[PDB]
Every structure is written in C-alpha cells, then in structure tokens.
Amino acid sequence: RLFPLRCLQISSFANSSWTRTDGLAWLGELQTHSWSNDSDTVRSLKPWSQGTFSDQQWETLQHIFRVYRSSFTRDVKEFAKMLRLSYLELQVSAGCEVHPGNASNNFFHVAFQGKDILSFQGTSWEPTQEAPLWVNLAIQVLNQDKWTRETVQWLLNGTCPQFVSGLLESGKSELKKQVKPKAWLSRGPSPGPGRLLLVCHVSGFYPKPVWVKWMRGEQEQQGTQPGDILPNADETWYLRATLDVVAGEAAGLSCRVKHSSLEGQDIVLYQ
Template identity: 50%
Template sequence: MLFLQLVLFVVLLPGGGSEDDFQETITFRIILTTSFYNHSWTQNQGSAWLDELQTHGWDNKTGAFSYLQPWSKGNFSNEELMEVEKLFYTYSIRSPSIYHNHVTEWQLEYPFQVQLVLGCDSHFGEASVGFMRIAYQGSDLVSFQNTSWWPSPEGGSRAQQVCTLFNQYHVSSEIVHKLLTDSCPRFLLGLLDAGKAYLQRQVRPQAWLSTGPSPGPGRLLLVCHVSGFYPKPMGVMWMRGEQEQRGTQRGDVLPHADGTWYLRVTLDVEAKKAAGLSCRVRHRSLGGQDIILYWGHHLSVYLILLAVTVPLLLLIVLALWFKKRCSYEDIP
C-alpha cells in the first residue's frame, strides 16, 4: 500500500508547461529529494519545473503546494489539487521507511539522498508518455518502463534488489503505467494551454559591448552582453565581416528574476586586431533583423559624447565665473 501511495501522489502532482510552438521539446519534471541523515532523521524537498522555469514549490512541514505562476494549476480542480497535496504529504512522511528498512540489504550508508524524478515531454504540442526515475546519491538507480521497474546499468546489485521489491506490487505497476501514459501527458497539455500567453511571449534583447580583464600584454578580452530576452534560445557570435571567429567563448545563459535571460560571450584577441570585429545577436523576437554591434563604434560614441560634454561644461563654468565677477564689480 505504501508504494501504491507513492505512485499515486507522484504522478498526480501538478506541474507547469509551455507551448511548443517556439521550442521543439518541452520537459516537465517533478523532483522529490529525500535526505537521510540517520535512521530517525530525514528531510524532504519537492518542486516542479518546466525546463528551467520552476512552476511549483512545496512546504514539507504543511504539505501545501505553492503555485509560482498564475497558470500553475492548469485545468485541475481545487478538489484534485487538495487530494494531490494529501497524497504527497503522506508519501513524504511514510516513504523513508522503505529505505530505512532495507539499509543493510541494499547497502545504503548514512547520510545519503534518494531522488525521484517524474515528468512528461511535449513535442510540438503533442505530449509523450511520461517517465519515472529514482536515483541514489546522484546516480541512476531504477526507472519505470512499460509496466515494470528496470535497474540502471550503473546501479549494480542494489538496483536489482530495489526492482525485485518494487515489481512485487503488480497493481501499483499497472497504475503507474496508466498514469504515465494518460494523466501526466493530459495534465501537461492543460498547463501548456493555461500558460500559453506567458510562455509564448517574446521579449527583445538589449546588447552592449565592453572589455573584460586583460588576458595578457597586448591583448583584449572583448565582451558582448545580451540581456532581458525571452524565450531562452539565443545566438550570439563574434564576427569579422561574415566570418565567425573561432575563439568565441559562450558563457552560461543566466536567469533574471522577471523570467528573462542574460548571456555573456567573449573573444580573446590581439589589441591591434580588434578593429573590424563585431558581435552579432540573433533571436526570435528580432524578426530576422539581427543586432550587430561593431567594436570601436561604442568607443567612438563615448569620444563624441566627451567631445561635446567637456566643452559645454567649460562654457558653463566660465559663464558662472564671469557672472560672479561682474556681480562683485557692481558692489560700490
């Protein structure tokens, strides 16, 4: 019964989705991590993610879900969501006993972590059969395929023993199969529809150039910054004319708090060869009109601003001095 409860709450756990019109594959994942510190002390952390966007949090003390997006409930009713919360909380309290009771048999060593990942993929608006995997200490242990649990090749004898136990619950396996092939994909498509406006939005990037720390004598580290764009796929390359520069180094795409993204792309070049280089930015929101920033042009703009600003400031200072002097001369 315990494993059956695990199955029910995990598959029904609500998640978030996105429309596939702008991305070939969208992956929705539910992650539950249980940390085993000793035989009497465990801690659970749960969340749900749409690719890299977190759609749900979970309070392990009250068992309540937090809906991080306005559309995170999808098309589930409040009654369904409350039932899922109860199942999830029940599992989080009772499931650790499965591993505690088999510490010796499965050669588990405190402290350790067990992570369950369940999810669905959506390809161009069509949801695929769901998946369920369990990992031990960050390494794959077992996965559910078709109607039964299968050991991971890297799981060794421990994975074989876990499968032997889990596959004894035939009714549970049938429920897992049904929920992964029906409930999870159906719920994902409901979320994709509920979050369509948000997930299909397009936000134009802002781009600018700068220099980074000097790589060495006579060299420059050119930096192309691209910020505030959505969706995530972004093409940035340092160019000379129409030729891509092979030394281009792409950083990680980092999230902003508002759901948009930031990317930093660098190029290490000889200072004397920097002239004529440009940074090309390609993104869906630009409608085919790439942003091209030429190295040296931004410096020219700064020089122009200085050339205009400095004389203007001098004139203002001179005028104030002259006015002040005249006021003194008018005093009898």
C-alpha cells in the first residue's frame, strides 16, 4: 500500500477582477488539508495533519502559502495581459512519495484550461511537448525567478518527504484502520424483455481496495458489472455490482464480497 502526498490547487479567473484559489492535500486516499479562498490558513483536517512539524515550522509554511497564493494570482493576471489570453482555469498537482530505498520521487504539474502545459523538472520550469508556443514565453519569465525556483526545490526535495514521513508516523493508526462493509441486494430495472437486473450494493468499507463479484457457488459469473467506487461522507466507500440474468437464472445466485477488514470471512448474500 502507498501513501503519496498530492497537493492540489484550483485557481479560477473569471475576469481580471474576480478570482478564487482553493486547495487541498491528500495522503493516500485520505484528505488531510483543506485550503479555502476565504481563509487565511490551510486547515488541518486531522489531529495528525501537522506531521512532526513544530508550530513555528507550520506557521512559516502557512506564511509561504499565503504569499504564494497572492502573487500567483498576481502573476497569472500579468501573463494573461502579456500574452493576450482570454478569460481562465489553472490547476496545480504537486507532492511526493517516500520510498525508504532512496527511490523517492516528486512532481509539480501545472495545467491550463484542463491541459498540461508545464511542470517542474530538476531545477526549472519545463513546458510539455503539446503545449502551445506562448507557454514558452511564460517559462522564460518564470525561470528568471531564482528564489521561487530554489524554494520549489526545497519544498519538493526537502519539506515534502520530511512531511510525509511525519504524517506516516503521527497518523499511523488511522492509516492502518479497517472498517467492515455491509451489503444488500435489490432488484434493478428490467434490462430487456425476459431479463431482470440483480443489484449488489456494498457500503461502508475502508480502506478503498475491495472485491465484489456475482457467483453461482464458486463459478464467478463473467457478466458481473462492477460500478465505480464512490465516496461516503464518513470516508468509507460504496460499490454497486450488477448482473443481467434470464427470468429463471436469478435463483441460486449469490453476491460475494472480499475485503481486507473481513479476514477471509467473506460476505455472501444469496438471491
């Protein structure tokens, strides 16, 4: 199991005078931070969200983001004027993964109107191949900012893996927690004329990895349709698995659920 840290920024520029920037951080599947345009601070969502950082460290990290947010939206408005761009959706996805064998990696990807345009590579900003020409002009300006460049490297190479190591420790018990799902069957819409839709709902499990198949005893029905894994408000997950059978094929059929919290005691519901 892996717990990368992904820091996500959503900056929306409706025109030259109206803009919002909002952020959040994820460790693995769990949201640890929330960063609101209304707020003067990034909010720790968990008792362990601060990692092993000192209060004085967190505060200057708060300061860094606070000035980052201000001049980022300053700078975006400049480039939009400079490069004659029409009104704007920017997204940032930055963070890192800790691998105890030195194979530790990090990333800082920026997207414009939903498309990758540039990322941080080694030491400087680098455009992607498919990005428009004009992005080249902006990277010429960005790479003249040696302090922003030195700081981004410190955050990626230094602050981030330090932070992830502290979060893995101070949040150890919640990360390893197991919550058992419940399941229930229901009749879905008639898919055809002589057909009935068997529906197996599975809700309440954590963490995310799960296995749900319709079965006739031990014969896994290849017709099993697994839904998306959808989130509940309490950080568990929900899953719908559907089967299209003929009028009389329903009887004798069972939904099987295997999850890391059950300890081999699968859930099995017979139709």
